[PDB]
Write a protein that binds this ligand. Structure first.
Ligand SMILES: [Zn+2]
Lengths: 249, 49, 73, 123, 18, 55
């Protein structure tokens, strides 16, 4: 009714927004009850990059992880997937928007990482950019470990190894069930006849430099058999030498 | 005592930057270039000019 | 290939503005009697969600809320 | 009367750590105490401010909260688990927490019996 | 749930996934 | 006019040699030569790769 004209006006504001102080009606959006209708009136597909960055900042600042979850699932990730496919790179404002979305890790993991790696259509450039965005942000140990376990459980793609390796690069202490799952994953590549990219080999490598102190003898020989069956002229001797130069417990 | 050693290592770094780059001297951004290089002139060729 | 000199140049950016750190701000919220009674110096908001916990910033004339932006005189 | 109070306390802290019922520090420990969603209060005896101890005692007396006193705060940070560990489990992050507030309990048969026995002996 | 197990030397935290 | 002497020899950057293990000399070198060209032969359809063939 009468609020529709105001929200149409701020919709027209957001279509040409570059900077400045936002209208105060936008800053009280997560306090509303029927917020999805208001968001559909504001037309998020027509927002600019800085306006969407400030929208992500507003929704991340106002708690309520489920609303941020549905906002990241419905609005932010389709815009990122559209923007990478067009300009072959991510904008500065949207990069800062995903950083401000990693200001809340719980809504980000279930909202941006897991749907992208579960869709199966994630390209290389999206995977590299997003994994660098995780790499930039300091992350909780339990959250990163659960993301590790979930990525290790799902089906393999060329993108998934990039996230797996870049989460290994954080070098935190890992829960042992997660180590069991990733060992089961790499042993799931024991009998695969598909040719593997260099990213899988590098991910396994960085796993062997970092977590060689927490490898039991059985899985040590299992990864040795994995190196035997799936060799590489350069990286396989490195993993093999790092395996013979490891102390357990 | 250590000042001479620091100067000696500075001389080593100056010699390293003199061999890998022959005669490039940085233009100072505080002093105008026509003042610090007042007495310098350009030659068309070092042999024939 | 041909290498570059990588001109050094100094510029001091060590001085950047930072907000002042308030140490032990829990002291001014409550006043404790010798018997053990608690006196609330600041108003508690009757809001929808952040009630019974959030105290008010005391302006020169007015009290202000810091989670839901509540307005008074 | 089998296992001690100073191990049942870490068991209660752990069961709160899984169940997400710990108000640590100063500000979450105080405002959730006044919301009547909190249950227990633990204070470090090693303190730099005395009216801090007076305020903690006043909060405990106002809402009949049982007060537990431990010697120093760095050991309390070791008890709670506010330390960053290695792969082996070596802490490098030594941060001490002063006000430790227990909101929710884990359903225990050993630590709960001991802590209610100590509370009944105290009161 | 896998088969091979970490066996020895301590579990610091239970970890929450549910 | 012109006529520099030893311009490039004295002007080139001086790089020291690497330290590698000593080569086998004598009959061992001929053994290593023989079991490289006639023993561990690699099957190739046209044999387009030489011993020093790089890139
Ligand atoms: Zn507010």
């Amino acid at each position: 009714p009468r609020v529709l004209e105001v929200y149409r006006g701020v919709r027209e504001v957001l279509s040409k927004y570059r900077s400045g102080k936002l209208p105060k009606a936008f800053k009280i959006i997560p306090a509303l009850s029927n917020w999805e209708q208001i968001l559909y009136v504001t037309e998020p597909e027509a927002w600019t990059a800085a306006a969407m960055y400030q929208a992500t900042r507003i929704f991340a600042s106002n708690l309520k992880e489920r609303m941020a979850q549905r906002f990241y699932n419905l609005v932010l990730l389709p815009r990122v997937r559209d923007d990478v496919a067009e300009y072959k790179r991510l904008n500065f404002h949207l990069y800062m928007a995903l950083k401000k979305a990693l200001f809340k890790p719980g809504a980000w993991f279930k909202g941006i990482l897991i749907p992208l790696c579960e869709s199966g259509t994630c390209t290389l450039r999206e995977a590299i950019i997003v994994g660098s965005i995780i790499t930039k942000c300091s992350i909780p140990v339990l959250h990163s470990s659960a993301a590790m376990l979930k990525i290790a459980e799902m089906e393999y793609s060329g993108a998934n190894s990039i996230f797996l390796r870049l989460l290994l690069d954080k070098k935190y202490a890992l829960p042992y069930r997660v180590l069991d799952a990733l060992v089961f994953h790499f042993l799931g590549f024991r009998t695969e006849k598909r040719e593997l990219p260099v990213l899988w080999h590098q991910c396994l490598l960085t796993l062997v430099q970092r977590y060689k102190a927490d490898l039991a003898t059985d899985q040590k020989e299992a990864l040795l058999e994995l190196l035997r069956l799936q060799p590489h002229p350069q990286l396989s001797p490195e993993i093999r030498r790092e395996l013979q130069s490891a102390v357990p417990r | 005592d250590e000042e001479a050693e620091a100067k000696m290592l500075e001389k080593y770094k100056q010699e390293r930057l003199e061999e890998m780059f022959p005669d490039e001297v940085d233009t100072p951004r505080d002093v105008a270039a026509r003042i610090r290089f007042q007495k310098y002139r350009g030659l068309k060729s070092f042999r024939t000019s | 290939a041909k290498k570059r000199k990588k001109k050094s140049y100094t510029t001091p950016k060590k001085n950047k503005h930072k907000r002042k750190k308030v140490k032990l701000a829990v002291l001014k919220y409550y006043k404790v009697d010798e018997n053990g009674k608690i006196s609330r110096l600041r108003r508690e908001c009757p809001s929808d969600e952040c009630g019974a916990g959030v105290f008010m910033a005391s302006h020169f004339d007015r009290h202000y809320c810091g989670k839901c932006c509540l307005t008074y005189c | 009367g089998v296992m001690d109070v100073n191990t049942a306390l870490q068991e209660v802290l752990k069961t709160a750590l899984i169940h997400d019922g710990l108000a640590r520090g100063i500000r979450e420990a105080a405002k959730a105490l006044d919301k009547r969603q909190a249950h227990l209060c633990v204070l470090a005896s090693n303190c730099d401010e005395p009216m801090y101890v007076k305020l903690v005692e006043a909060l405990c007396a106002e809402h009949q909260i049982n007060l537990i006193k431990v010697d120093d705060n760095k050991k309390l940070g070791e008890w709670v688990g506010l330390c960053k560990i290695d792969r082996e489990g070596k802490p490098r992050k030594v941060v001490g927490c002063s006000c430790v507030v227990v909101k929710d309990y884990g359903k225990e048969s050993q630590a709960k019996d001991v802590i209610e026995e100590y509370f009944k002996c105290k009161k | 749930s896998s088969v091979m197990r970490r066996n020895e030397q301590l579990t610091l935290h239970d970890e929450r996934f549910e | 006019s012109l006529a520099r002497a030893g311009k490039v020899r004295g002007q080139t950057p001086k790089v020291a040699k690497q330290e590698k293990k000593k080569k086998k000399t004598g009959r061992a070198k001929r053994r290593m030569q023989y079991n490289r060209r006639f023993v561990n032969v690699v099957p190739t359809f046209g044999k387009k790769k030489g011993p020093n063939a790089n890139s």
